[PDB]
Symmetry: D2
């Protein structure tokens, strides 16, 4: 949830890819619950 | 520029992992770029 | 189940990123399960058993 | 090329997800490149 964990990565290219996915997953907590629904009602539209 | 594309997936479990990643990547566009920079600066 | 499903994606950049992740996840099925288990055991050991210590269920 | 880097992750769920992706990317080296081409050709056959 808030646990600080370290992921060992081999190479800059893999690191940059995992960093972009890590960021998107962590940034979801900075989104309002209304945005997360607005988008989800737009997905089935 | 955001077109609608369909990704064929083999397996339920792979589909679920990909769905969670797709949502988080697409939802980033609904964040102000200032919030993304505020977060990135806080990470370093 | 290993069924054919279609994931709708908005944007080329997200699609290409998902395409690369899908390929590596699907390509793992082309490896013997014994290779995957061995690789995972070798990963557990390294970095003062970091991946072992960071395992949630024990 | 394959420099050891540590990615700090906040949250168990994000960590487990990234760990599974990292593993799949690293395990691809254990595949013969003929298998990767066979798979890619088979993917554009059902497209």
């Amino acid at each position: 949830d808030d646990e600080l964990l370290y992921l060992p990565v081999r190479g800059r290219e893999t690191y940059e890819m995992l960093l972009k996915i890590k960021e998107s997953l962590e940034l979801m907590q900075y989104l309002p619950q209304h945005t997360i629904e607005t988008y989800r009602q737009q997905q089935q539209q």
